[PDB]
Amino acid sequence: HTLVWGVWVNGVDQGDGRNIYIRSPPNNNPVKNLTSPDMTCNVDNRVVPKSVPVNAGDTLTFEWYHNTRDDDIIASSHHGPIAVYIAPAASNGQGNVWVKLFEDAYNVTNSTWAVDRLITAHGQHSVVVPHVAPGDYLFRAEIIALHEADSLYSQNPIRGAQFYISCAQITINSSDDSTPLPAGVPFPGAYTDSTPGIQFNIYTTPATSYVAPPPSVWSGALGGSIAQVGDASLE
Ligand SMILES: OC[C@H]1O[C@@H](O[C@H]2[C@H](O)[C@@H](O)[C@H](O[C@H]3[C@H](O)[C@@H](O)[C@H](O)O[C@@H]3CO)O[C@@H]2CO)[C@H](O)[C@@H](O)[C@@H]1O
Ligand SMILES: [Cl-]
Ligand SMILES: [Cu+2]
């Protein structure tokens, strides 16, 4: 159970984005139905009044929280991966539009899941803004909690992989468009009951064997991190 509070751009806090530049759902409950329209941008997908200006090459940091800013972030039980996707905003997230910019699942070096490191990072994970066409975009940050993912939601709707999905409205101003955005995958649709990484038993199956759901990270993607960029306590 987690939500996005706002974003930072090059370590500068853009301020509380909830219902402002984040298409915030009404609460932190997960999405679990893989064929739900709610898989696009969570249960209240609509245009919000602001879009955060960035340029290609900026560091864009998403900041998550549980109940209040810079708290426990997400229950520690919620082990799983983190991904970020991008789509042109005019699509409203519909159709074959989502391109993956970031994946972090289980780090064998550190023996930690992305969610574990997100807690340590005070809810902060970042991407480099890619060199796509200037314009308005949706950045879809997705945490998958796997603690009940041994079951398919379609078999037992009390369980299943849990999707904490947050769409941020980002406007890319200065970009050379050296890597034009291609078509991508649909949400709902990209993840199905047979997709690797959706049904996974963290109690019985080693995390060293976990394969995150496709698609693969796009060749145009410039990278990211799971790390505290900004100190909310200084404000
Ligand atoms: O026993 C089932 C699993 O529970 C997990 O805890 C979640 C609770 O099930 C859920 O009821 C609770 O929801 C809270 C939410 O955290 C809070 O922010 C909101 O204000 O109210 C909700 C209740 O209406 O969330 C927790 C997760 O934080 C355990 O984490 C898990 O190990 C356990 O299997
Ligand atoms: Cl939960
Ligand atoms: Cu939860």
Q: How was this structure determined?
A: X-ray
Q: What is the resolution of this structure in A?
A: 1.6
**What strands, in cross-sheet order, belong to the sheet with 224-226?**
12-13, 3-9, 59-65, 124-128, 224-226
Structural domains of the chain ordered from first start = 3-234 (2.70.50.70)
| Nearest in space to 56 (alpha carbons), one of 220, 139, 168, 173 | 173
Q: Any residues with Cβ below 6 Å from ligand 1, and which? A: 1, 28, 66-67, 75, 77, 147
The one-letter code for the residue type at 200 is F
| Nearest in space to 137 (alpha carbons), one of 149, 127, 147 | 127
Q: What are the tokens at 85?
A: 């996707």
Give the Cα separation of 169 and 48 in Å (integer): 8
Cis preceding-peptide flag for 188 (omega within 30 of 0): yes
The DSSP secondary structure of 72-140, one letter per residue, reads S-S-TT----EEEEEEEGGGTT-SS-BEEEEEE-EETTTTEEHHHHHHHTTTEEEEEPP---SEEEEEE
The one-letter code for the residue type at 186 is P
| Nearest in space to 223 (alpha carbons), one of 139, 104, 115 | 104
The one-letter code for the residue type at 221 is A
CB 86 within 8 Å of CB 172: no
Give the Cα separation of 125 and 61 in Å (integer): 5
Give the Cα separation of 80 and 74 in Å (integer): 11
Distance 25 CA to ligand 1 centre (A): 17
182: left (phi over 0), alpha (psi -120 to 50) or beta: beta
Report DSSP state, residue 115. H
CB 198 within 8 Å of CB 34: yes
Ligand 1 atom nearest the C-alpha of 28 is: 18
